[PDB]
Amino acid sequence: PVGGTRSAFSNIQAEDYDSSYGPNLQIFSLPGGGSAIGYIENGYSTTYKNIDFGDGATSVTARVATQNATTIQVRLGSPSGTLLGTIYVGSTGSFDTYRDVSATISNTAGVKDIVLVFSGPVNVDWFVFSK
Ligand SMILES: [Ca+2]
Numbered sequence: 001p002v003g004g005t006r007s008a009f010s011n012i013q014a015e016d017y018d019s020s021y022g023p024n025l026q027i028f029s030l031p032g033g034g035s036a037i038g039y040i041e042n043g044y045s046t047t048y049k050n051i052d053f054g055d056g057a058t059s060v061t062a063r064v065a066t067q068n069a070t071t072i073q074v075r076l077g078s079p080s081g082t083l084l085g086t087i088y089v090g091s092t093g094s095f096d097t098y099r100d101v102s103a104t105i106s107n108t109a110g111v112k113d114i115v116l117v118f119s120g121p122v123n124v125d126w127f128v129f130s131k
Pocket of ligand 1: 013015034035036124125126
C-alpha cells in the first residue's frame with residue numbers, strides 16, 4: 001500500500017481503530033492469541049483512517065462473534081458518510097465463537113477513511129476487503 005497507509009486487502013485488526021464512538025467499547029484478548037473489540041452497543045462505531053483500496057474492492061469480510069443477529073455498516077469518512085454496504089451478522093452461538101461473514105460493497109478505490117457502525121452487540125476480530 002501507498003506510504004502512510006494500510007492495505008484494504010490484508011486483515012485490518014478491528015482493535016486498530018484511530019477513533020471510536022461508544023463509552024463502553026473495549027478490546028478483549030482471545031484465548032488462542034489476538035484481540036477483538038467488544039462491549040459494543042447500537043449506535044457504536046469505529047473509524048479506520050487511511051485504508052488503501054488501490055484500484056477497487058467490491059466485497060468485505062469480518063471475523064465476528066455474537067449471540068443475536070445484528071449488522072455492521074461499512075461507511076466512508078464518518079458514521080453519516082456514504083454507506084458502502086452492510087454485513088448481516090447472524091448469531092454464532094457465543095461471543096467467543098468467531099465466523100467469517102461477508103457482504104458486497106459499492107466499488108471503492110484509492111485512499112479512504114472507513115467507519116464500522118454497529119446496530120447491536122457483536123465482537124470483531126478483524127475485517128478485510130477483496131476484489
Ligand atoms: Ca484482532
